[PDB]
Design a protein around this ligand. Sequence first.
Ligand code: C9C
Length: 263
Amino acid sequence: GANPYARGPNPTAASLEASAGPFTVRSFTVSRPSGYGAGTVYYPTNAGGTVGAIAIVPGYTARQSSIKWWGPRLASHGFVVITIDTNSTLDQPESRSSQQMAALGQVASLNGESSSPIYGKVDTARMGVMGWAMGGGGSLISAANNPSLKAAAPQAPWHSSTNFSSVTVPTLIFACENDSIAPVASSALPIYDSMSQNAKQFLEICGGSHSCANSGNSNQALIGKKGVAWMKRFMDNDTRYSTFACENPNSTAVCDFRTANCS
Ligand SMILES: O=C(O)c1ccc(C(=O)OCCO)cc1
């Protein structure tokens, strides 16, 4: 009968483009990070059922600030989101992946901790990964190594190998047209093209620098719509979001759009 994971009101373009989703969001600092540097957990206070968890990792030299906007944006639509700082700002993608997954493990821990604000708020069987640049590469390594993850949505990803043919997790790649750090033609697009087994999508922002999907970007309506739609469709199996997840948004800000195996 009903989808047990469906949360919130039926979506519209306006409701997904808005700065905030329907749920009230609170946050806390992780007291003793388990296998990573630091974290902030964002959660809905009024979701009305358990929700999936998403761990988000920054790029080389970067901190939570670069990725923080995703925390309230996703949590307000019905997700527990952990943004992390890595053990070193100079960690590489394999270490970033390990830390991302340690952060998901700690969110699953806190779901069982009676003192935690997220006590009983998480469905530990439904998880996703996001991250910027080397943290985006780390997200793809997380997905390759943990195929029970339900979704991945890295931004401006880089890894030393572009071969993610092993990934079976639904994966949305945000790319930045004018990226001079991890050029689209040598990084994000080859990564996208390597993936053969999954639902996948590629969304490149016109004129974007390497930071085009970071906190303070000028395309939060489109990027936030797509990220939330992808996570709802695939983490919650929520087919109310099938068209938002799969469509070409046919937007003036999009300079390359590709999708395959989307439903
Ligand atoms: O995480 C990053 O921001 C980061 C991403 C990519 C690189 C790198 O040198 O790629 C070489 C291809 O241009 C370095 C740092």
